[PDB]
From a paper:
In order to facilitate the purification costs, we searched the ESTHER database for a thermophilic esterase, and identified the Esterase 2 from Thermogutta terrifontis (TtEst2) that has been previously structurally characterized, and presents an open active site that could ease protein engineering for further optimizations. We determined the bimolecular inhibition rate constants for five representative OPNA, namely tabun, sarin, cyclosarin, VX, and paraoxon, to estimate if this enzyme could scavenge them at a fast pace.
However, in our apo structure, there was clearly no density allowing modeling of a whole HEPES molecule. A water molecule sits at optimal H-bond distance between the catalytic serine, Ser126, and the main chain amide nitrogen atoms of residues Gly53 and Gly54 which form the oxyanion hole.
Author numbering: 6 to 172, 181 to 281
The structure:
């Protein structure tokens, strides 16, 4: 991956101006697109530990889902190696992206109620923050337009950020807030949007146990929260180019059937 990314064929829209930085959405429209459609949308957040990464990471997935009838985009967001930000600022950026898409749903040809948030690792964390973590919103935006996504597709996300529980200072200094405030696990509750999670059993960056604990506690609250374990796979397994795209093709396959499952996508 490179940054700045190369995104051929994508339409470029600035969704947020902050610190004189113009944060961009790379939008991939389907074939039979008109401003009057009400298609589902998916917004991808790249990974890279809230410090690096590139919107090009999920460009392959955008092209796939746009070919399947969605308005697919990859969001840029501020990161530590480029901008003076902490994790809490990254969350505000991800929320701005969802709010912007909903605010512009009419011109995007999008159903404001079928907006999916998605991401890998740190960007999987952000996507989950847009469905279940409160506040951390850009203070000058219209809070009467909801920043909450309607579904989430998570690729080995980080879901537990605070040790407030059973079983360090470097982390608290890159968070920009109390650890619980940026931790999806400590905001599990009933009535949350549906979601599907792809995680590796041998993940040594984000332990699989932290995700299975999240998913179980999410089911006892009545939410749709499906784990798809990938046996022996490690952090990053899903990415286009890993092995020979067996995980990439299967994650796309199980994500497609999940969007059909909740009604955001039409059968083939």
């Amino acid at each position: 991956l490179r940054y700045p990314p190369e995104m051929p064929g994508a339409e470029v829209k600035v969704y947020k101006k902050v610190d004189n930085v113009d944060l961009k959405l790379y939008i991939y429209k389907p074939a039979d697109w008109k401003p009057a459609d009400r298609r589902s949308a998916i917004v991808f957040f790249f990974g890279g530990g809230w410090q690096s990464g590139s919107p090009a990471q999920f460009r392959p997935q955008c092209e796939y889902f746009a070919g399947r009838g969605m308005v697919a985009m990859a969001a840029d967001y501020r990161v530590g190696s480029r901008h003076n930000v902490k994790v809490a600022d990254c969350v505000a950026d991800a929320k701005s992206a969802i709010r912007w898409v909903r605010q512009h749903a009419a011109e995007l040809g999008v159903d404001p109620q079928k907006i999916v948030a998605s991401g890998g690792s740190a960007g999987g964390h952000l996507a989950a923050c847009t469905v279940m973590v409160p506040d951390l919103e850009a203070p000058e935006e219209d809070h009467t337009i909801s920043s909450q996504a309607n579904a989430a597709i998570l690729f080995n996300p980080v879901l537990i950020l605070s040790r407030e529980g059973l079983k360090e200072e470097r982390l608290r200094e890159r968070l920009g807030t109390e650890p619980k405030a940026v931790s999806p696990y400590h905001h599990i509750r009933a009535g949350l949007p549906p979601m599907i999670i792809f995680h590796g059993t041998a993940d040594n960056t984000v332990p699989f146990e932290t995700i299975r604990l999240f998913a179980e506690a999410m089911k006892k609250a009545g939410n749709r929260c499906e784990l798809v374990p990938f046996e022996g796979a490690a952090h990053g397994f899903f990415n286009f180019g890993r092995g020979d795209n067996l995980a990439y093709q299967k994650t796309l396959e199980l994500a497609d059937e999940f969007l059909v499952e909740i009604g955001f996508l039409a059968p083939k």
